Amino acid sequence: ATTLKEAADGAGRDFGFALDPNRLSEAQYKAIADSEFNLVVAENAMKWDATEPSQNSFSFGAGDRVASYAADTGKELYGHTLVWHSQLPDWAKNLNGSAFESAMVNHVTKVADHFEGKVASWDVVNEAFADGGGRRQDSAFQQKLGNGYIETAFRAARAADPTAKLCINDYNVEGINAKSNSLYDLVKDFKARGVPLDCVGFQSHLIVGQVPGDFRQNLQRFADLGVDVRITELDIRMRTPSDATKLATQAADYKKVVQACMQVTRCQGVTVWGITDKYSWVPDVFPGEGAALVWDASYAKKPAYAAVMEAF
Known part of the structure; x- marks a missing residue:
């Protein structure tokens, strides 16, 4: 396979990337985007603030731009995201109880x-x-609606789109711990009670050299619940600057993550959170860290590239 797309295709898996529509006008970005991936997700175009900036006033321009790109290039489209405490416009954080629940179901619909x-x-x-x-605790959804909002959101979604696979996504749930255990409990319950839920996504915003040794095991127990699992926002950061060893260990981490997915028959595939290091969100949140993606700021393939390819 000359491309990761080919490597992922042959393995029958998705290999996606987080698209920023505004960068499709940069030749090298678009070239990599069209060649190496078979799935696309909007980095920000489909979130609450970008879609309903004012109550009941929807803006689908950027979202449609991403969907058009997926359709024109023949890639699978992953939707991100309906209900999320972050990037919630103020009008929403300003509604209470009932009023707030209607805004939520309506936005989801x-x-x-x-x-x-x-x-x-x-x-x-x-x-x-x-x-x-x-x-x-800091979620407006949790505070105003309590524990039942998750269920409300999923039922509203299945009813608005009867065939889309409905997932719940999170970070720091890659390995077995108190967070993934609570997630596990929720899936098991939903499944048993018949709440529409089809898949579980693991963000995988990892740190170089610190890839969970029980990643595969964790993935597997979730699948056992009769649900599909997916790696959703993969990037393995390091303290900048990078160097031979860091790149070498990062390459190794990318290989482990992809192999973990390849070993769980129900792992749909992996989506990396961007294409090039120059546009990566990491530096803006984790000051001092970076070099997290498969391509550097100069669109040069990093060792992680051949790693991912070997993993598939």
């Missing part, structure tokens, strides 16, 4: 309905759990 038949899978609820187990 419109966005899902608008992309029906285009979006194959949706991150219906993103980051619901707290690190260390339990529910996220």
